[PDB]
Amino acid sequence: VLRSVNSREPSQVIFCNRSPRVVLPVWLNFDGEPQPYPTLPPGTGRRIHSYRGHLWLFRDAGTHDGLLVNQTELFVPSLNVDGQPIFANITLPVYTLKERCLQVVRSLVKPENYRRLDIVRSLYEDLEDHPNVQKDLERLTQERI
Amino acid sequence: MDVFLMIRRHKTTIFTDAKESSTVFELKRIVEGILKRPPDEQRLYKDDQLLDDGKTLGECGFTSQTARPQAPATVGLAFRADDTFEALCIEPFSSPPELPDVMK
Amino acid sequence: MMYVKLISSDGHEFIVKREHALTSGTIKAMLSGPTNEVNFREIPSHVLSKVCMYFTYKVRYTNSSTEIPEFPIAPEIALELLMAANFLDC
Numbered sequence A: 001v002l003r004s005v006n007s008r009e010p011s012q013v014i015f016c017n018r019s020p021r022v023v024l025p026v027w028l029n030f031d032g033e034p035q036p037y038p039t040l041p042p043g044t045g046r047r048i049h050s051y052r053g054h055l056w057l058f059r060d061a062g063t064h065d066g067l068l069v070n071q072t073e074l075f076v077p078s079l080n081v082d083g084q085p086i087f088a089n090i091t092l093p094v095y096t097l098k099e100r101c102l103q104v105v106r107s108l109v110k111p112e113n114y115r116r117l118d119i120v121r122s123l124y125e126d127l128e129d130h131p132n133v134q135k136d137l138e139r140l141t142q143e144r145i
Numbered sequence B: 001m002d003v004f005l006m007i008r009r010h011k012t013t014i015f016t017d018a019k020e021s022s023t024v025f026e027l028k029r030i031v032e033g034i035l036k037r038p039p040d041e042q043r044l045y046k047d048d049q050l051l052d053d054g055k056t057l058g059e060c061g062f063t064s065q066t067a068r069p070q071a072p073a074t075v076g077l078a079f080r081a082d083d084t085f086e087a088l089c090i091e092p093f094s095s096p097p098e099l100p101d102v103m104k
Numbered sequence C: 001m002m003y004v005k006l007i008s009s010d011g012h013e014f015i016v017k018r019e020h021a022l023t024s025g026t027i028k029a030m031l032s033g034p035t036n037e038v039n040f041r042e043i044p045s046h047v048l049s050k051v052c053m054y055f056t057y058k059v060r061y062t063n064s065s066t067e068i069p070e071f072p073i074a075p076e077i078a079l080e081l082l083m084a085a086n087f088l089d090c
């Protein structure tokens, strides 16, 4: 259900990374399979050639933490007016304090050692349930209908 | 520009924001609304330095660069008990424990 | 603004806007019931001060086009801040 439309209509795009993260752009191919593209360093831009009706999402390259693009989850290139490229502004969301703490603990503790931390067992399961594009595509398909 | 502050006395910490262009006196009116002590019974400090009523928070060094929502700048507060002002006293927060081995 | 007082396990009093404290569904329940003070027997001042900075950060940056900076957490407090965030549902 979440897949690029095969328009073959070129759409020029600027990926603008306004986050402090290394960004992984992900293209949803015509089968709905996520295809990773080369990463963007923090505060950098990249001109890319895409197509009308193509679906993109953006993650932290290292952790797969979710990022926003134009303040939403999915970016669809549209018609270029007067040859002007479409801006994809990639930003940190406001993470919950809990999700932000899980990010910092995952950054400090090898996953073999989660079980050694002095916390309730439900929090081990929250650490172990890493952000993952495949999980989010499952969530997003149910929210679509 | 909004500046984001912690106004601190003893074991009291107020989180509030104010304009860079607003005055030390106007910040004492904020503190009055909350702690019910008039401006003339208040001294405000940046670190150990007494701030002048008529100065802007910007002129006292509270700027958007230094006084951020997620890292607010500290204003010291001292009260006049009757005749004279207590010394500026700010109780430190508790100490975190040692990093566990597995986080080193 | 209505303010509320949040008191840490070591007796530090944090006075924050009520609207900011209501970021926590747990705090909303403790203030409304089924008072303008809440005591946290389990949250020390080095953790509760950070929770209040999070409230300020969240209200400032929610629904904002202005580029959002990272909420910083020191390694030393991450574990206790995680347990507080989990209880407070924020």
Ligand SMILES: COCCOc1cc(Cl)ccc1[C@H](C)NC(=O)[C@@H]1C[C@@H](O)CN1C(=O)[C@@H](c1cc(C)no1)C(C)C
Residues within 6 Å of the ligand: A006, A008, A027, A037, A038, A048, A049, A050, A051, A054
């Ligand atoms: C290849 O060698 C140069 C480096 O290729 C890169 C590198 C970066 Cl970082 C970005 C874009 C590109 C290239 C030019 N474009 C892309 O891959 C664009 C971005 C998406 O819309 C999918 N896509 C496609 O071409 C598809 C396509 C073709 C047609 C027709 N309809 O769909 C795919 C079949 C690959």
